[PDB]
């Protein structure tokens, strides 16, 4: 019946990183998110979207306690997406250079999803995560939030960028990373997200690690949306 999808997107400075000859990861995330919300607006289906950005300059957040919860803003609640939720995507040239964390948008989106299921029946809770994974982590409480992810039975898809280990353009059935797009911070990021995904849902979390190259190549954004035929 009614779908309630949520996007959470890193809009950080490194996400708007410099171009060695290819593209910005910010513009790649923009192309992918325009493809998805473009299909789910032009298909006239009865779903609602809510989107959260992290890596901004200000914090107009419903919860900003201290040093944590910085540069996170709920753009829009669960709405049938019109062209306003597409021009908020398109007319947003600013990346807003002040980057804080990457795990905050999941718990803020979970809190507002709980606030958004107010007498409105929903069968799916799918949240898609774009993160370049360049900032440091935050490890205050982990098993309580992993327990909430487990008990609420929500879905978390993970778009990592092109760095997965000739002319790499966007996606052409060629290479994922051109020659080297990784470092120590990206290494610990990839291993900690593999650990969380495997330990929560299993080997499908190894399959739910999608690169920005191939997510434009294939249909991998639409999952657990349709019904029996």
């Amino acid at each position: 019946n009614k779908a309630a999808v949520v996007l959470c997107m890193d809009v950080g400075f490194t996400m708007s990183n410099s171009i060695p000859g290819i593209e910005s990861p910010f513009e790649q995330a923009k192309k992918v998110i325009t493809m998805f919300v473009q299909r789910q607006v032009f298909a006239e289906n009865k779903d609602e979207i809510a989107l959260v950005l992290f890596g901004t300059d200000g914090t107009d957040n419903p919860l900003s306690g201290g040093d944590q919860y910085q540069n996170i803003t709920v753009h829009r609640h669960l709405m049938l997406p019109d062209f306003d939720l597409l021009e908020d995507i398109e007319s947003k040239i600013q990346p807003g250079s002040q980057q804080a964390d990457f795990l905050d948008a999941l718990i803020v989106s979970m809190d507002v999803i709980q606030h958004e299921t107010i007498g409105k029946k929903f069968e799916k809770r799918h949240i898609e995560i774009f993160t370049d994974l360049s900032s440091r982590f935050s490890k205050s409480q982990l098993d309580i939030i992993i327990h909430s992810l487990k008990k609420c039975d929500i879905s978390l898809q993970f778009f990592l960028p092109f760095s997965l280990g000739g002319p790499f353009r966007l996606g052409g059935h060629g290479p994922s990373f051109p020659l080297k797009g990784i470092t120590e911070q990206q290494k610990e990021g990839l291993e900690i997200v593999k650990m969380v995904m495997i330990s929560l849902e299993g080997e499908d979390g190894l399959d739910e690690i999608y690169s920005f190259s191939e997510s434009l190549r294939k249909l991998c954004v639409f999952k657990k949306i349709e019904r029996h035929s």
Partner: protein, 490 residues
């Protein structure tokens, strides 16, 4: 050629004996011939309805022909199968039809010889079309129509050769006088019996052979050859209606328009836009933009590499496969390259993969070219011609995903009795014959409408199985197959 229609003259022997019942009480050979001719017209009126069909009785008393010969009387003329001509034809049945034959033309005369073939020749000469095949189908029994004069025999075998050279071929359905294969006599020179193929066997068929597209195969850069994409399984359907004015039964020449800008006045097509509303607002285009937003490629097949025949799973399916062939009409020297690529693809079990655009503005479409090789013996059996096959391939949103979440097994004992049941129902499948009941009953409905005979000839339903010839065929193992482990158990 392409539009060269088939011709057929029926030539019937009505001279001395067949009008009589050959001193029998069963079926006169004259009635046999009229039933066979009527069944051939009834078959070709919907089987091949552009061909030419004439009918000529010889040996009768009075005569009419364009040549003005004695005792040769034509009935119809070279044209299509017409319902009014077969309703003229069906009046020569039984004793009353035999007497109608008598009062109309009268049987019995000094029947001559090859001048009847001359009348057949002038009947073929005056057509104003093109004809592929010329067949004279002679319906007779006897053996010696030149039993006294030898010059008549020499003239007969001269005029038959004069029909032999310019492309007119005859066969005679030899009427068995006692009902057997007896007369092994000396007309194997004139000719190049069984009549069931003339009696029933072609109730639904159509004759056509078209190329469907004539494209180019390019090896992704500049290397171009020609190919033409023929069709094999086209999913035929009944012909569509025609509007008609029920007073005089004439069609009514439909014309339509768009008008009325809420005042009065036409709109020639230059002042209409093409719109799509999406909730609140509109999106307006022009007709040329809404036809331009699907344009990707030149028409043809661009090659994108090679894959073996094994890893493409031939159950992925959305459209029937077509069939390529290497013409030498666009480029020259293409059958050489395709034969070389085909034998190397065969001896390395590999298949081509391509991107395909049929027409001058069509979005692109991925196809798989899988080879095949022919087969031929002394009997000239033909199940495969030597080309490729274009398996169409789905992209991404053709496949749905079923809910899948059940898994419960049982004991491996029912597989033996089910093997016994499937071996009980084991047979060779077919080569033809599972005909469509809806189209066939519609055919016979139209037959009985245009001929007002009696009734709908109820078509036998071959698509239905034979439950009487299946249940007692398998026997009393169905109770044990039902109640070994699984009765519903209440």
């Amino acid at each position: 050629k392409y539009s060269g229609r088939d011709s057929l003259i029926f030539l019937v022997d009505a001279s001395k004996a067949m009008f009589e019942s050959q001193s029998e009480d069963e079926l006169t050979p004259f009635d046999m011939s009229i039933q066979c001719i009527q069944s051939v017209y009834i078959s070709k009126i919907i089987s091949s309805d552009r061909d030419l069909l004439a009918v000529v009785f010889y040996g009768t008393e009075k005569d009419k022909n364009s040549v003005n010969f004695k005792n040769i009387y034509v009935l119809q003329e070279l044209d299509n199968p017409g319902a009014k001509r077969i309703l003229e034809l069906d009046q020569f049945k039984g004793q009353q039809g035999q007497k109608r034959f008598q009062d109309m033309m009268g049987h019995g005369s000094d029947y001559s010889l090859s001048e009847v073939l001359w009348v057949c020749a002038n009947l073929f000469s005056d057509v104003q079309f093109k004809m592929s095949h010329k067949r004279i189908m002679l319906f007779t029994n006897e053996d010696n129509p030149h039993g006294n004069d030898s010059a008549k025999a020499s003239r007969a075998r001269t005029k038959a050769g004069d029909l032999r050279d310019t492309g007119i071929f005859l066969d005679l359905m030899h009427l068995k006088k006692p009902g057997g294969f007896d007369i092994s006599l000396f007309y194997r020179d004139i000719i190049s019996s069984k009549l069931e193929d003339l009696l029933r066997k072609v109730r639904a068929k159509e004759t056509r052979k078209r190329a469907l597209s004539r494209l180019k195969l390019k090896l992704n850069k500049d290397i171009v050859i020609s190919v033409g994409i023929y069709n094999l399984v086209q999913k035929a359907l009944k012909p569509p209606p025609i509007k008609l004015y029920r007073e005089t039964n004439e069609p009514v020449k439909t014309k339509t328009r768009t008008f009325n800008t809420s005042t009065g006045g036409l709109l020639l097509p230059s002042d209409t836009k093409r719109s799509q509303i999406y909730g609140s607002r509109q999106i307006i285009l022009e007709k040329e933009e809404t036809e331009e937003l699907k344009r990707f490629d030149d028409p043809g097949l661009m090659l994108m590499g090679f894959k073996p025949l094994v890893l493409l799973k031939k159950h992925h399916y959305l459209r029937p496969s077509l069939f390529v062939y290497p013409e030498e009409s666009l480029v020259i020297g293409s059958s050489t390259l395709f034969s070389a690529l085909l034998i190397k693809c065969l001896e390395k079990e590999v298949a081509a993969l391509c991107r395909y655009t049929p027409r001058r503005n069509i979005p692109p479409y991925f196809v798989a070219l899988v080879p095949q090789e022919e087969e031929l013996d002394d009997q000239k059996i033909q199940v495969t011609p030597p080309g490729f096959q274009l398996v169409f391939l789905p992209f991404a949103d053709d496949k749905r995903k079923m809910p899948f979440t059940e898994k419960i097994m049982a004991t491996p004992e029912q597989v033996g009795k089910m093997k016994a049941i499937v071996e009980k129902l084991r047979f060779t499948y077919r080569s033809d014959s599972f005909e469509n009941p809806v189209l066939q009953q519609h055919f016979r409905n139209l037959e009985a409408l245009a001929l007002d005979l009696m009734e709908p000839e109820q078509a036998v339903d071959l698509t239905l199985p034979k439950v009487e010839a299946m249940n007692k065929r398998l026997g009393s193992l169905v109770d044990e197959f039902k109640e070994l482990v699984y009765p519903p158990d209440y």
